[PDB]
Amino acid sequence: SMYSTSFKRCCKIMERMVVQNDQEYYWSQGDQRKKNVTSICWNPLYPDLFAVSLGSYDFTKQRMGLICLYSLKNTTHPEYAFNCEAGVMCLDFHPKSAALLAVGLYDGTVLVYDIRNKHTDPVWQVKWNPDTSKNYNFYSISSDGRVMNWILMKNKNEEESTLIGLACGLCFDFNKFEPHIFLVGTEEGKIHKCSRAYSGQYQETYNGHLLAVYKVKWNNFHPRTFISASADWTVRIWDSKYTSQIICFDLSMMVVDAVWAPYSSTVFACATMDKVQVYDLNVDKLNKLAEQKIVKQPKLTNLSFNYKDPILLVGDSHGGVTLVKLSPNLCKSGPEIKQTEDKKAMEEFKNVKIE
Amino acid sequence: NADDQLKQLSALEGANGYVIFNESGIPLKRHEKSISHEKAVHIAALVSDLWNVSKKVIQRDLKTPENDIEVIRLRTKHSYEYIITQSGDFTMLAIQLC
Amino acid sequence: QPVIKNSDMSVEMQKEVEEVAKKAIDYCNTDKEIATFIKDDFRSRYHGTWHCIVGRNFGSFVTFERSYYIYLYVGQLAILLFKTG
Amino acid sequence: SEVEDTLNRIKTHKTVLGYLIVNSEGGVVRGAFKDEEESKNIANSIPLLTKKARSVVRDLDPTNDLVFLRIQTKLNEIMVAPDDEFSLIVIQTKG
Amino acid sequence: KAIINSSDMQGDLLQEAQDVIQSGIENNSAPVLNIEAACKYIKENLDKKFGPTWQCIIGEGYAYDVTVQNNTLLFMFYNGNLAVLIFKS
């Protein structure tokens, strides 16, 4: 008993025995010198916690698949990890709080792990549907398009529960206010919409610019505004209330990751080839508001902004991590906040102008 | 280096009681006695003796002699923070929020 | 800065009290060591039995030999020295 | 076993110069020091000051215990993890 | 609220010591009280009662080191936080 109590003491002992005085650069290279960053995400339960996923090309190293966890104040290397020879992608976390971890395996299967613990088609996207009464539903879009969904209280999780929806696109974005409705850009050059009641209830398509779209998001503000970006480097403001898109904006690198910034400004960002092109439509026109190449390592991979501080974190194609801070571009604080609904009305005016 | 900076220092949020005391153990100014005058006297005397012990150790067998205390800031988390900053004549202490 | 608050000795023995107290302060950081320094010093120079208490919040009532008692403040320490036996 | 794991991880932690695992007594179980007498004077007198420290942290009130004593100096870093039976001290570079 | 901490003497003198420290509290029971007057009273009472060379000491945080005759020493605590030592030499 004395050994175990000394162990419990020594645990937190080491924990804040690593944290020493610093100015606030965490450039993680745990193994991942031959890996490639596939995703970066943050945690709401722990606003100072971030989880990254990478894919490796060299098997002569530690293990296969990747899920790494670490906090902002913790040592540069990933503090906690999950060890196995299983390639793991499609990563998401428990919606209420970080208690369960869900992953969509490469062979169409799905796995779930207790965080408080030591098919001829892959899955493409994954999402939790938070039902506070109990466990929280799971939706996985496969690489053919078809959607699956289920949830089970026993997490050792059994995919016996299942439901299937006739889905054609790969990255399904869901309606923030009404989660049952979803949309997607298909390779056929359209953007389909539907919902959870029937997979065939509402099978028309959004035709803002009518291109093969491979990315969708939603303006994390008052309206029911979303965005869809195509292989043809085109970005598209799908206002849910419209069938014709608002601002058919247009820029190279729109195939790749897009995002709404965690600021009051409706800032947009695209990023490939160690280069980010950034839009602040709240202060200027649709031309790019900023652009930055990075010489740290080539071919920047996935990124992450947190609302708290502009310590923007990014990975590289070499598997490493890095971060920089440009605080002067934090916020403008007058035009972004309450004039943003007026700005969306102004975008609709720009549509009337297009006509 | 003036009462203006001192007032700013009092305005530093999170700090509860400041205690500046001459090495003789005399709390000249304060913001802890402003809540309880029997606190900073005990604290100043006890911590002056503690700093004497710290001098002994900063001069005992591993710390080369001729090396002085520079700052001994301590923190009892969830209780308070207590900075000690030695001077040639003074000792700046502060009881802040941890 | 010694501050005599109640002494019985002659002025020379008092001066010796404050000098030995200053030396004990120069040498020993712990009150017990200071008091033993003073007590042994006086018990050795004179003969008999001395007792020294060093504190900060302290009252007592003791018997003591005539002109063999001091209660004072050296710096900010309460020194109560006396001879009994 | 966890004492082994933590000693191992401290050794893995670069910038450490002299490791010092003691018990609650003045017994250095393992030490990455060039001379042992130096570590002896410390691993003996520092527990004395640690008894003084627990004394005063309780003199406040029995509300907290001395969980750590991690000091940083100009030259190095004296990490001290008070433990039930042990005490985990390491001399590191203050990075 | 007497809380005896270290006893050396006989239980009768125990009881009388408690009674005397109590009476001293009542002699000086007011925010203007000083522990010194109660100390005078304790020592002088135990002199005129059980003989001279008594010694009374009152406080809450301090460190004594004194010589005492056997079966003539007491130290104790109060819920009012009064640590009281008495001893004969």
Residue numbers in the entry:
A (entry chain d): 235 to 258, 933 to 939, 961 to 1047, 1062 to 1099, 1114 to 1312
B (entry chain F): 6 to 103
C (entry chain H): 8 to 92
D (entry chain G): 58 to 152
E (entry chain I): 22 to 110
Which passages does the manuscript contain on this structure?
Each HC of the axonemal dynein consists of an N‐terminal tail domain followed by the motor domain. This includes six AAA motifs (named AAA1–AAA6), with a microtubule‐binding domain (MTBD) connected to AAA4 by a coiled‐coil stalk, similar to its homolog cytoplasmic dynein. We analyzed three states of the ODA during the power stroke cycle using in situ cryo‐electron tomography, subtomogram averaging, and classification.
In the pre‐PS conformation, the dynein heads have moved ~ 8 nm and the γ MTBD ~ 13 nm proximally compared with the post‐PS conformation. In this pre‐PS conformation, the linker is in a 90°‐bent conformation, which is similar to the single‐particle cryo‐EM analysis of cytoplasmic and axonemal dyneins heads in the presence of ADP‐VO4 (Roberts et al, 2009; Schmidt et al, 2015), while the stalks are visible and point proximally toward the adjacent B‐tubule (green and yellow in Fig 4G–I, respectively). The γ stalk of the prestructure is in an extended conformation, attaching with its MTBD to the adjacent B‐tubule between PF 7 and 8. The stalk of the β‐dynein appears to be in a curved conformation, similar to the conformation it adapts in the Shulin–ODA complex (Mali et al, 2021). A weak density between the PF5‐6 on the adjacent B‐tubule suggests that the MTBD of the α HC binds to the B‐tubule with the α stalk in the usual extended conformation. With the combination of rigid body fitting of the crystallographically solved cytoplasmic dynein in the pre‐PS and the recently solved dynein HC in the Shulin–ODA complex in which ATP binds, we were able to generate a real‐space‐refined model for the pre‐PS state, which agrees with our tomographic maps. We have built a model of the pre‐PS state (at intermediate resolution) and show that the linker, head, and stalks of the Shulin–ODA HC represent the native pre‐PS ODA conformation.
